[PDB]
Write an enzyme that holds these catalytic residues in place. Structure first.
Site, PDB file in Angstrom:
ATOM      1  CE  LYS A   1       8.531   1.012  -4.851  1.00 14.23           C
ATOM      2  NZ  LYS A   1       8.222   2.378  -4.335  1.00 14.23           N
TER       3      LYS A   1
ATOM      4  CD  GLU B   1      15.780 -10.842   4.479  1.00 17.18           C
ATOM      5  OE1 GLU B   1      15.828 -10.985   5.713  1.00 17.18           O
ATOM      6  OE2 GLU B   1      16.792 -10.635   3.779  1.00 17.18           O
TER       7      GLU B   1
ATOM      8  CG  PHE C   1       5.603  -3.446  11.442  1.00 17.86           C
ATOM      9  CD1 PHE C   1       6.240  -4.683  11.507  1.00 17.86           C
ATOM     10  CD2 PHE C   1       6.204  -2.424  10.709  1.00 17.86           C
ATOM     11  CE1 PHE C   1       7.465  -4.881  10.882  1.00 17.86           C
ATOM     12  CE2 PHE C   1       7.426  -2.625  10.088  1.00 17.86           C
ATOM     13  CZ  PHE C   1       8.063  -3.853  10.180  1.00 17.86           C
TER      14      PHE C   1
ATOM     15  CB  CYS D   1      11.642  -8.160  10.439  1.00 19.47           C
ATOM     16  SG  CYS D   1      11.582  -6.734   9.346  1.00 19.47           S
TER      17      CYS D   1
ATOM     18  CD  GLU E   1       1.517   5.894 -12.234  1.00 15.54           C
ATOM     19  OE1 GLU E   1       2.476   5.733 -13.026  1.00 15.54           O
ATOM     20  OE2 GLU E   1       1.086   7.024 -11.913  1.00 15.54           O
TER      21      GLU E   1
ATOM     22  CD  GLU F   1       4.310  -7.968  10.371  1.00 12.65           C
ATOM     23  OE1 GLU F   1       3.829  -8.151   9.216  1.00 12.65           O
ATOM     24  OE2 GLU F   1       5.542  -8.054  10.592  1.00 12.65           O
TER      25      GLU F   1
ATOM     26  CG  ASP G   1       1.194  -5.231  -9.120  1.00  9.58           C
ATOM     27  OD1 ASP G   1       1.755  -5.666  -8.096  1.00  9.58           O
ATOM     28  OD2 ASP G   1      -0.033  -5.133  -9.205  1.00  9.58           O
TER      29      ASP G   1
END
Lengths: 461, 468
Positions: free
Chosen positions: A163, A238, A374, A272, A198, A372, A201
């Site tokens: 995904k 990560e 980003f 990252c 949706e 963070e 999880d």
């Protein structure tokens, strides 16, 4: 482009019939669609993976490696397309896209190259797949991350349900297609797009999942961890960080500046290991800051064909950035440069561009220094001692990357132990994880056993 | 014995003043007390650990190893005491206790022997003037959660390597077996572990366990116990992102093919089920025997079971269950088995013993036939001297039976057919298969250095920004 699902060897639509629109971060207009997979679709994919697993395993490493090589070759042949896709979906400068593609290629190559690589008692140690792997790839490098994930897993004999991020399905889809072309069999690789609110999880906690490999935000990782208590899956996570960038008084100025530029503005700070906090020695501070400002002034935003820096990935991110900036402002901070969207002509004005932003009067305890970002935004702070600097660096929930510029060897040595971070970059800018060991202990003596706690006088009858 | 807390180099009482009683599983009477630590106490311990960390790290591996060696020596000198404690708290037969002690000693020795052997490394960078230095460093603050079933051995496993690698430790043992752990801690202290490096916290997990797990400053959690507990721990650690080392037992199938050496097989079975009264991660939990020999084998097993003595550690073959609750659970399980068709072939109740022993938590060796593959006896961990048996008539079938389980850690096979053995090596999906027989604490960090002293060239940073 309109992306679809790949489930049990077929390109199919979502079972619910729903799709999600994909926006260009360069123009802010819809440029594509992806299918919004259901729970049912996910289940189907998982089942397919399960079905394919044994067959895949039996092919042996060599065959798998062959396939991988073929895939790599195919990618190389059509890399331009991939690059274009990347440019479309993430708005990365052309150069950056190219680099990413190169990286992808190299990683694939590398992973392919791991193919085949008492006196009457023996222990046999086999290294075997975990089984069904779920791969979650964040859009920071929507091809590179895919490459990192898919290849080694595939080589080690695992089956995969991928995904990608809802923001960057296209590249992932292309990669999947390439893999299929190369000869990956039905069910071995499945591709599921859809909004995580949706299904995410559900995908995580599914009964049959054995391993989850993921790169992304810390919160997401935490959530994943929580979920996996249901199925006890092996986790590879990560989760980025808040890298301090430290410049001592004796630093080579130019080099340092270059590094800073790379660290903050490469991929518009969406990395990252990106520079997230700036600490500069009081003796040079002011000058350094100006220089930085000047440099920032010179960076062009806009079209990937000629820009130095790209847009943020989506509207939401942009909004968040704006909010952060506002917070910084409405609490004392001096915006030394930027702090808003640029003013661009034509379609680009509705893209999600944000100016290089540099902030002074910066509180060590503030959101800018503790959470963070980003994005192409950084706060700067003076330092006057090594110990102090170290303390500042360590004052964070996140410990991934860090950067240090100095010519004092002692300081460098000290930071090697005092800076509690996984990587320290000084004056410059896994495969086994997917295998499970199983042991088989055999005694072939054919003689009577003697066990300390079992009385042998039970067997004089 | 009355056990206490060890926090920042001092033996102290709980801040709340509360204690918990420790029962003898042999007599069922209270034989000791331990302090019921508060959240506050835990916090204090953590703080102490944090304080001590850097100092500990700076001592270097060698010094740590020295200390460990000393501790080991001390333990060896006074092993008898430890053995006695074990006997008191767990009711293990003397032999078993001795074995455990030996194991503890050996593990300590082994862990000491890794001093200076996990050194750092230097590898090539991307040019001749670049290097990557790879140091191996502690995680920081370690929480160690040890179970009751091997209450010294597990401690040894946990404490030693962590200590050697330069981590500081907060140990919470099981509420059922503090004493051994406490003794070990004391020994360590004597050997020269400095203040704050090792902290000892006892207390009921229903009050503090979760708190201990999810605390802001914890870096690593090392634990052995039940699967549910592990799951809970995992859930909790989402708060602090701690590195997790979890060992969580299983439901080991015990498989006996028609051509097995009978005697040996029987012995193995006895060991597997009755060692520590079945309270072990790799214990025999399901029995599958070939139809051709089944009946005979079962009898033999029954006969063997008949001969095992329960009672005093000084002379018993098998000890009691750890606590009343466990016993009750076992009883309930047995009842469930009964009230759903099953034939109890032997045992199935508490024994009938004289004096104080009848109020201990002993349970008879229990063997069950007419056993449903889908039942609680075959699907949920038992951790007690009880097993159900089932016939088999094909290899494939057997394999299927073995694999039909949520938990898959250990497995046993008795046969002289090499082909079968080979096949099981791939078909039995378990971490260990026993055939005819019965660095985690270090973080890698990289330092990338460029020494060239020349201008850098980075594709995406334009050098025409530095022609002014």
């Amino acid at each position: 482009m309109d992306t679809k699902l790949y489930i049990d060897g077929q390109w199919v639509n979502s079972s619910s019939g729903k799709t999600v629109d994909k926006y260009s971060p360069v123009t802010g207009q819809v440029i594509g669609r992806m299918e919004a997979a259901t729970r049912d679709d996910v289940d189907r994919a998982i089942d397919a993976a399960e079905d394919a697993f044994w067959a895949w395993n039996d092919l042996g490493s060599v065959e798998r490696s062959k396939i991988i090589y073929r895939a790599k070759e195919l990618i190389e042949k059509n890399r331009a397309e991939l690059e274009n896709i990347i440019m479309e979906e993430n708005g990365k400068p052309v150069k950056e896209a190219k680099e990413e593609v190169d990286g992808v290629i190299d990683q694939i190559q590398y992973y392919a190259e791991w193919a085949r690589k008492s006196s009457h008692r023996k222990i046999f140690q086999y290294k075997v797949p975990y089984g069904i792997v779920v791969a979650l790839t964040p859009w920071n490098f929507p091809a590179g991350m895919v490459a990192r994930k898919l290849a080694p897993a595939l080589l080690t004999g695992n089956t995969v349900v991928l995904k990608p991020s809802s923001d960057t399905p296209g590249s992932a889809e292309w990669i999947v297609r390439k893999f299929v072309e190369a000869g990956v069999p039905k069910g071995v690789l499945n591709f599921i797009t859809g909004r995580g609110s949706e299904i995410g999880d559900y995908i995580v906690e599914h009964k049959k999942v054995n391993l989850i490999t993921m790169t992304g935000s810390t919160a997401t990782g935490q959530r994943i961890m929580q979920k996996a208590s249901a199925n006890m899956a092996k986790l590879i996570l990560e989760l980025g960080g808040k890298a301090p960038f430290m410049v001592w008084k004796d630093a080579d100025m130019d080099n340092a500046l270059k590094t800073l530029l790379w660290a903050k503005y490469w991929n518009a700070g969406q990395s990252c290991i990106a520079a997230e906090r700036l600490y500069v020695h009081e003796d040079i501070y002011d000058t350094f800051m100006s220089r930085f400002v000047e440099l920032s002034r010179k960076l062009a935003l806009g079209d990937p064909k000629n820009a130095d820096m790209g847009p943020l990935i989506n509207k939401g991110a942009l909004q968040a950035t704006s909010e952060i900036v506002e917070e910084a402002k409405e609490s004392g901070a001096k915006i030394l440069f930027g702090g808003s969207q640029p003013s661009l002509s034509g379609p680009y004005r509705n893209g999600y561009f944000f100016l290089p932003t540099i902030i002074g009067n910066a509180d060590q305890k503030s959101k800018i220094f503790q959470e963070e970002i980003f994005a192409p935004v950084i706060g700067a702070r003076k330092i006057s001692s090594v110990e102090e600097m170290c303390d500042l660096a360590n004052d964070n929930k996140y410990g991934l990357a860090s950067y240090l510029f100095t010519k004092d060897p002692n300081i460098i040595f000290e930071a090697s132990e005092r800076i509690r971070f996984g990587e320290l970059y000084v004056n410059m800018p896994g495969i086994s994880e997917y295998l499970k060991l199983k042991n088989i202990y055999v005694d072939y003596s054919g003689k009577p056993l003697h066990i300390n706690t079992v009385r042998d006088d039970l067997f004089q009858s």
